[PDB]
Amino acid sequence: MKCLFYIAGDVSNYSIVNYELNGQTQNTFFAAHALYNLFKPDKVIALIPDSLVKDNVSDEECYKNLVINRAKELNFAGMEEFMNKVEIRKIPNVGIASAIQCENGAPKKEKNKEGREVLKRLPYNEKRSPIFIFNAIYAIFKDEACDEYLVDLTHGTNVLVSIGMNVGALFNAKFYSAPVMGMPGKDSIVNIVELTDVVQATNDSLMIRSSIENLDERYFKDYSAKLSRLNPTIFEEEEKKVLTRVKGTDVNVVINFLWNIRNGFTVNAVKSMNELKNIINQLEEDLEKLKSFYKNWEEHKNFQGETLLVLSDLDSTLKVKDLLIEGNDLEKLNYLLDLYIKASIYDKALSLARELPVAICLNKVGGGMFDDKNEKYKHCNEIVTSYLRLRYSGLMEFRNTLMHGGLSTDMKPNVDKDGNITPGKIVTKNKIEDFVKRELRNYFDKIVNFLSSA
Amino acid sequence: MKCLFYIAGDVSNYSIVNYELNGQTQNTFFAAHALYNLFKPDKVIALIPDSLVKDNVSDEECYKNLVINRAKELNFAGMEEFMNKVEIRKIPNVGIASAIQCENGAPKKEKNKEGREVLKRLPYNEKRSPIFIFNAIYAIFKDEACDEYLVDLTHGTNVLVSIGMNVGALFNAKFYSAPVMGMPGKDSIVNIVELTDVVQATNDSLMIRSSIENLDERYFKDYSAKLSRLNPTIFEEEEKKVLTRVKGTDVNVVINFLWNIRNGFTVNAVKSMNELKNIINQLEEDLEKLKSFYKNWEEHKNFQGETLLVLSDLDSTLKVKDLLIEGNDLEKLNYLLDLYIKASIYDKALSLARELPVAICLNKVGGGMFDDKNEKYKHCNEIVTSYLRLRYSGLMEFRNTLMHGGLSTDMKPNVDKDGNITPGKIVTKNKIEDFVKRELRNYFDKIVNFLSSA
RNA sequence: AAAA
């Protein structure tokens, strides 16, 4: 069900500290145990790098005894029922380190220089690839099977913690880390910091960036709820005014813009362009002020506790500026044609290349409505349709196939007695790709060049 | 252009140690300096937490003097060409970390034996949000205006390092980390591990997962090249036997499956389903064996250096198993309709809902071809078209609108003398979403229920 | 704050 994963470090350098989270204190010498008592996950998994403990039979059993040895030192009540419950799973490491030479699952001892000390087998040298370490931790997470993943990033090497964070990200883990000062001591009430929001904020930004790149709103993570809930407890004059502007950013108009583009509502997408231009012009202003605020963060201490205003979400939204152009609605539609081409939306690109010359034609004749009852449209459409069938036979063929899809007269499939269908034509993946990406612009530009003379 | 970023720690417990990267060798007391003369970047940014030091005038100048104070104790032999060109930028922190006092241009300190002990500030308490820290670091990265980002995750608090890693990810940074593992005692040759590949492998998996989720091949990160260029020099009989299978996984058939689905080649997508079923049935077998290999990684040390085989890339690909179903091509197309609905591909869902009942009808009559010359098709199409226009007027309307898009008779826009277009029907995002997500399946099931009696 |  709920599993706590933690990467192990050298316990001989641990002291009793009073870890804190929301006021619910936990007195221990390692953060993993504190988080166990707080969250109380059903399964606890500690990853121990081969860099640490080493023995003749079981390194996992030596680590279990190493922790109870530092529980017998400093006189701690726990580690008997706890370490018995913990599932110890060994992981690979890289670089040079010092391991411990245990006798028989019990770490050994030998007095060197000052007095009794663990005889560390100082040389350990292994060259491993971080993705080998990644694959080792991944397999543990995957086959472990949990409904809720909890990852402790407090203890362990910076290499293993970063690797563990990226594994956890693929299992929708909650991340925790409890950083402390160099040997604090008694009554050290250090805070456990949750990092879940930070890993989500970066995933959200990469998704927002790709959403504008591939003209898809399904990838745009809507931060409407975050901004609407955002409120300054204490606001210090013009740190209240700029937040008012940010809270009022129409992120819904951006999502709708991407929806219309994706779904082929080309006239609506283009009509929204000037509104969007004013949305991101304000967003540019807001972000410069917010950037300046966080660059001189010492003066805007009021934002120190805020979790709803994330700079990357807003900065990633500024990319939508690339989807915008200045000019008449025909020039805006012409730009959109190029956008569909780059984004590999073959269907929408071909339909726009077919219909835009009719509108171009209509404009030349003084205007009209896309309706069969309109004489100007009737003749304008007849001209572009017949000119396309006369010269650009390929354009018109790809258009109708993409428009009607597989189950259609355009593809001529055959349905049998058994309920099985055999395609009637070949789906030319690279020919469609090639035509749109290499000739649709050159062809369109020639069609519109001809229709200018009209 | 190329610029290095590092987060700072207490220079107090730092010893002069040699480093290693691509065979390069460099001796210093902190990894950031080693990486500086290894790569030689145009700018170097020193991110210093507010818990690190505290001066009456400039905390950045005290850190600048703190590092030269530690350089003096033993032979630093440097900082006359690295201490000039480094931009010190203060960052916020969290917790009860103990700060260290500063006065004008000096860090003070007192003897109290052991030579001259560090003047610990002793108590500091700040409760900040990790996204506030994230926004602070983001603003620094964003406004630094760099072409190539390089991030050092060796030094600093585990909270600040993980936060820095997620910021770096949004700037396409290369990540490096060199942990010590114990008492160095000079030299030791601590190795700097690059983590770029690990952060990319997880981003790639999230993209692969979303690609299957939204039926889009543009998001699927192709790992064919990795797989082909993968061959360990020494390989066991059981290792080779299963790696041979992995190297032969037809990831191209999965990408093509997603291409046909996105572009509406529904018959072809459905025909590929059985082939795909075998592709994933083997990939499951290989994943169980590889998972077992990485779970018992101590026996398969041949993989210890491999960077091409990423478990997450293959495991994420297994999600395509959800896109598959058993049954005749009509039953497979029926399932695909539900897939288009869940994926919010309104155009493809409505065209399939319109054409699938014609095929259903054709099957009942013993089969036929989707062609106007076929009598069975002619009548079958006439029946579903008239039944849809009779009972499901809405379905037929949304279908043609989405099929022809904005510039069409289906939307009736009006073109001006000025070249500006005013939409005709302005059909909303919600009316379309609600209809297909809430009614399309119930309506389709009733259409097919009726056509069974045929 | 290079196995808090």
Residue numbers in the entry:
A (entry chain A), B (entry chain B): 1 to 454
Question: What do the study authors state?
Answer:
SisCsx1, as other members of the Csm6/Csx1 family, is composed of an N-terminal CRISPR-Cas-associated Rossmann Fold (CARF) domain connected to an α-helical higher eukaryotes and prokaryotes nucleotide-binding (HEPN) domain by a helix-turn-helix (HTH) domain. The SisCsx1 monomers are curled around the two-fold axis to form a dimer, and three of these dimers oligomerize through their HEPN domains into an equilateral trimer, thus assembling into a hexamer. Each dimer contains a cOA4 binding site at the vertex of the triangular assembly, and a catalytic pocket located 70 Å away inside the triangular oligomer along the two-fold dimer axis. We show that cOA4 binding activates a cooperative sequential catalytic response in a hexameric SisCsx1 complex and that the RNase activity is switched-off by Ring nucleases, which cleave cOA423.
The Cα backbone built in this map was later combined with an iodine derivative of a better diffracting crystal of SisCsx1 in the space group I212121 to determine the structure of the apo SisCsx1 to 2.9 Å. Subsequently the apo SisCsx1 structure was used two determine by molecular replacement two SisCsx1 conformations in complex with cOA4 at 3.1 and 2.7 Å resolution respectively, thus providing the molecular details of the RNase activation by the secondary messenger. To explore these differences, we crystallized the SisCsx1-cOA4 complex by soaking the compound in crystals of the apo SisCsx1 at 25 °C, and we also co-crystallized the complex after heating up the mixture of cOA4 with the isolated SisCsx1 to monitor possible conformational changes that could elicit the RNase activity by the presence of cOA4. We synthesized cOA4 using purified Type III-B SisCmr−α complex, and observed that the binding of cOA4 at room temperature, barely activates SisCsx1, while heating the reaction mixture triggered full RNase activity. The phosphate inversion in cOA4 is stabilized in both cases by hydrogen bonds of the phosphate groups of A1 and A3 with N158 and N158′ through a water molecule. A rotamer change of H155 in both monomers allows the polar interaction of the imidazole group with the A2 and A4 bases in each monomer, thus positioning the cyclic compound into the cruciform pocket. In addition, A2 and A4 phosphates are stabilized by the side chains of Y14 and Y14′. Finally, the anti conformation of A2 and A4 is stabilized by interactions of the base with the main chain of S15, S15′, F29′, and V180′ and the OH of Y19′, while the syn configurations observed for A1 and A3 are stabilized by polar interactions with the main chain of D10, D10′, S51, S51′, and S98 and hydrophobic contacts with M181 side chain in both monomers.
